[PDB]
Amino acid sequence: VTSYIGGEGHNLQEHSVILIRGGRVKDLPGVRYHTVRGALDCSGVKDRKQARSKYGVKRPKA
Amino acid sequence: MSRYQHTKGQIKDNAIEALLHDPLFRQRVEKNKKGKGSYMRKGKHG
Amino acid sequence: INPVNNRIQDLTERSDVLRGYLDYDAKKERLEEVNAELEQPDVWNEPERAQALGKERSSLEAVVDTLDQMKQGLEDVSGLLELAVEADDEETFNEAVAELDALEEKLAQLEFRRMFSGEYDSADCYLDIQAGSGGTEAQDWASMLERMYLRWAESRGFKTEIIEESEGEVAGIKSVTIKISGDYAYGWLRTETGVHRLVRKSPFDSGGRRHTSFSSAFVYPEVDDDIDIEINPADLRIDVYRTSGAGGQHVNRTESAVRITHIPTGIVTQCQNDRSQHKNKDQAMKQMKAKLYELEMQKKNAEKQAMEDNKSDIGWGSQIRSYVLDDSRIKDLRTGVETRNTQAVLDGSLDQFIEASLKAGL
RNA sequence: AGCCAGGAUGUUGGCUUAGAAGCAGCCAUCAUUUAAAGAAAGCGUAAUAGCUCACUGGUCGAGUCGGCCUGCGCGGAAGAU
RNA sequence: UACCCGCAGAAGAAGCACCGGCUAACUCCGUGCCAGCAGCCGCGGUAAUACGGAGGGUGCAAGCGUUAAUCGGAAUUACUG
RNA sequence: CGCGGGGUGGAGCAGCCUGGUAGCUCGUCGGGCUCAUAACCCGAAGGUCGUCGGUUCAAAUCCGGCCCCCGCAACCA
RNA sequence: AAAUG
Numbered sequence: 001v002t003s004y005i006g007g008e009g010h011n012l013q014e015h016s017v018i019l020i021r022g023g024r025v026k027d028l029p030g031v032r033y034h035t036v037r038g039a040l041d042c043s044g045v046k047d048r049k050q051a052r053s054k055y056g057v058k059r060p061k062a
Numbered sequence: 063m064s065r066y067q068h069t070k071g072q073i074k075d076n077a078i079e080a081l082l083h084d085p086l087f088r089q090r091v092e093k094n095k096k097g098k099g100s101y102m103r104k105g106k107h108g
Numbered sequence: 109i110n111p112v113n114n115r116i117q118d119l120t121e122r123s124d125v126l127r128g129y130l131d132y133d134a135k136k137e138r139l140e141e142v143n144a145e146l147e148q149p150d151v152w153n154e155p156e157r158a159q160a161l162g163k164e165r166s167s168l169e170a171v172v173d174t175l176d177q178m179k180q181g182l183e184d185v186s187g188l189l190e191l192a193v194e195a196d197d198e199e200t201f202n203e204a205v206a207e208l209d210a211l212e213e214k215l216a217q218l219e220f221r222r223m224f225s226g227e228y229d230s231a232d233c234y235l236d237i238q239a240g241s242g243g244t245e246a247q248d249w250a251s252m253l254e255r256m257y258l259r260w261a262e263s264r265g266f267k268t269e270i271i272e273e274s275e276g277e278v279a280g281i282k283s284v285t286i287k288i289s290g291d292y293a294y295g296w297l298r299t300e301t302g303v304h305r306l307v308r309k310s311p312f313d314s315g316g317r318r319h320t321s322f323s324s325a326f327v328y329p330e331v332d333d334d335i336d337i338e339i340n341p342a343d344l345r346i347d348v349y350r351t352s353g354a355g356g357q358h359v360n361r362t363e364s365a366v367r368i369t370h371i372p373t374g375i376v377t378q379c380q381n382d383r384s385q386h387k388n389k390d391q392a393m394k395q396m397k398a399k400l401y402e403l404e405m406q407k408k409n410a411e412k413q414a415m416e417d418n419k420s421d422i423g424w425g426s427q428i429r430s431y432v433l434d435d436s437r438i439k440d441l442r443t444g445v446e447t448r449n450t451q452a453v454l455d456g457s458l459d460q461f462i463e464a465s466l467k468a469g470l
Numbered sequence: 471a472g473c474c475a476g477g478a479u480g481u482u483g484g485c486u487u488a489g490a491a492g493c494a495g496c497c498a499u500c501a502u503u504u505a506a507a508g509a510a511a512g513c514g515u516a517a518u519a520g521c522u523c524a525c526u527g528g529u530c531g532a533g534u535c536g537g538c539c540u541g542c543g544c545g546g547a548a549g550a551u
Numbered sequence: 552u553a554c555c556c557g558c559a560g561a562a563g564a565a566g567c568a569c570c571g572g573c574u575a576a577c578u579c580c581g582u583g584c585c586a587g588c589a590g591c592c593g594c595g596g597u598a599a600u601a602c603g604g605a606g607g608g609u610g611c612a613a614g615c616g617u618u619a620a621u622c623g624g625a626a627u628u629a630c631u632g
Numbered sequence: 633c634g635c636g637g638g639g640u641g642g643a644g645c646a647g648c649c650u651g652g653u654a655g656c657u658c659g660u661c662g663g664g665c666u667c668a669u670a671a672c673c674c675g676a677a678g679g680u681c682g683u684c685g686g687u688u689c690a691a692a693u694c695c696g697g698c699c700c701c702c703g704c705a706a707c708c709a
Numbered sequence: 710a711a712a713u714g
């Protein structure tokens with residue numbers, strides 16, 4: 001299949017073991033899946049402070 | 063960074079030209095706010 | 109002496125710019141580490157390494173040395189400027205001027221080498237402009253670009269020649285090929301290869317909407333067409349043998365058929381059309397030559413294919429400039445240099461972009 | 471012809487080169503201390519270094535050197551009962 | 552063990568989603584069809600309550616979101632209808 | 633290798649037929665037509681006749697050489 | 710007579 005990569009910037013490349021979750025992208029032809037940010041080889045999105053759950057971003061400890 | 067997967071297959075002569083004749087470098091036409099293709103059924107916040 | 113002062117002022121600025129582009133501190137550091145490596149007596153035991161390191165060192169040293177020379181010379185000139193002005197000693201002033209000139213020349217030389225370090229940079233080029241997906245608007249944009257390029261080339265002293273022009277059915281051009289002859293023509297233009305972004309309200313659109321149209325420039329140097337070299341009989345195996353089916357008494361005996369084989373490559377050409385062996389060989393020879401030529405062409409093509417594939421890999425990065433006419437601002441995406449004089453740029457003030465690009469090395 | 475000795479100085483001539491110190495070349499090819507010593511003929515080096523040579527001093531004590539002309543020979547010269 | 556009594560001191564103990572419309576909750580800055588968002592409709596091309604951050608708010612709460620899964624809405628297989 | 637035919641602007645064709653003369657269709661350029669493009673209308677330009685020699689006063693044209701193309705023929709054992 | 714944007 002083909003799966004969308006949400007968020008600004010990703011560490012992904014060839015032979016990268018990833019988790020996909022489902023959910024189709026209306027714009028993209030044939031895309032039926034979203035990759036899960038913050039699971040397996042896929043990293044969380046950098047510098048996010050809101051909606052972090054969706055993007056695998058840990059709590060900014062202060 | 064990520065590679066762009068062009069819809070040109072196997073480029074033989076010139077890459078730039080091929081890219082130009084691709085969806086990547088398609089024309090972007092603004093939708094009118096006033097004038098011709100200007101009518102909005104529902105507003106952005108309505 | 110006001111012009112001299114102005115020149116002095118300029119020179120420091122350009123030196124600073126050069127340093128910025130070079131990344132001077134890093135270079136200095138590299139030179140230092142390499143120097144340290146050099147004096148260690150164990151490094152000359154490995155010969156291949158050592159020569160390479162030496163090669164690396166020298167250029168770096170030159171870069172560094174020239175840079176501070178520039179820093180010092182300017183300062184000296186400034187010091188002597190005062191003397192020229194207030195004390196009114198003429199000979200000293202003249203000397204200072206001479207020194208400045210020398211320094212300027214040196215700077216130019218350094219910048220020259222930084223710029224035109226590539227192999228084909230001195231040669232003349234074919235600039236190829238192609239209109240995009242837009243339509244009439246795109247064609248117009250392409251035409252505009254072509255015009256701009258022509259203006260630029262005339263400006264510095266290059267000879268333009270419109271080789272091929274495909275004209276737009278409504279307005280502008282569909283495609284154009286321009287031969288640009290002159291000293292370091294390709295080196296000056298090679299940076300302009302890429303897709304150009306026009307943003308303006310279309311005059312050809314009936315609605316009058318603001319369009320984002322694209323058009324590609326493609327600069328390639330006029331390579332010298334190498335002579336197709338004569339293959340040596342040492343590289344060749346010539347077999348002679350009897351023909352298939354044949355048909356007669358003299359045919360059964362005679363070995364007219366010729367098999368020519370290239371030893372380095374492994375290509376074969378057979379010929380048995382003629383009765384005469386010699387004639388067959390000649391024909392076979394010709395065939396072999398043709399095959400070799402074809403192989404050469406194929407190899408050339410394959411390499412070329414690799415190159416663009418790599419170029420394709422950059423994708424959206426082939427977009428080099430953005431010509432916004434509505435907000436009145438031109439931006440080079442590669443360097444980051446911006447100007448609000450859009451009309452001036454269109455007329456042919458590309459020097460500001462081009463030079464910076466060259467300095468960058470992109 | 472052997473044999474024993476020296477075979478230097480300015481000097482590593484500059485340049486262009488990654489380096490070039492007789493020997494990568496490009497080019498000049500000088501003068502010096504003089505018995506004689508090429509800004510170098512070969513080997514050698516990352517390049518120097520190093521090892522030879524040219525010419526010269528000493529020993530030794532009679533012929534010697536290499537061109538020309540010709541005579542006769544040698545190699546070049548491998549095949550199938 | 553449950554349970555009860557005493558001891559000390561606010562002490563050791565709050566997050567998650569969302570805020571264009573559906574759908575409860577809006578502004579400023581940053582970005583400029585880019586980056587990105589999105590369940591649908593669509594948002595973004597230099598004043599974005601739709602992107603990202605902040606302040607303010609709303610809903611849930613030791614959970615809160617996302618995905619998958621079934622029924623519902625869907626009278627959209629209608630026996631009722 | 634032999635016998636023929638050819639090479640004439642961007643293109644495709646003529647003329648070469650007994651040497652002096654450069655034509656047709658399309659294309660190119662400038663107008664006009666349309667809101668614009670196409671079509672259509674008007675007006676122009678553009679050829680060292682593959683190349684090198686030869687002979688007539690004179691060569692696209694005749695003759696020869698060379699380069700390129702297209703046919704044909706390249707056979708009997 | 711009259712094709713297209």
Ligand SMILES: [Mg+2]
Nearest residue numbers: 544545546547
């Ligand atoms: Mg003999």
Ligand SMILES: [Mg+2]
Nearest residue numbers: 570574575576
């Ligand atoms: Mg509301």
Ligand SMILES: [Mg+2]
Nearest residue numbers: 580597598599
């Ligand atoms: Mg804003």
Ligand SMILES: [Mg+2]
Nearest residue numbers: 570571572601
């Ligand atoms: Mg929303």
Ligand SMILES: [Mg+2]
Nearest residue numbers: 599601602603
């Ligand atoms: Mg937002």
Ligand SMILES: [Mg+2]
Nearest residue numbers: 625626627629
């Ligand atoms: Mg039902």
Ligand SMILES: [Mg+2]
Nearest residue numbers: 640643644645
């Ligand atoms: Mg023709």
Ligand SMILES: [Mg+2]
Nearest residue numbers: 648649650651
């Ligand atoms: Mg006639």
Ligand SMILES: [Mg+2]
Nearest residue numbers: 665669670671
């Ligand atoms: Mg017209």
Ligand SMILES: [Mg+2]
Nearest residue numbers: 652691692693
């Ligand atoms: Mg005539």
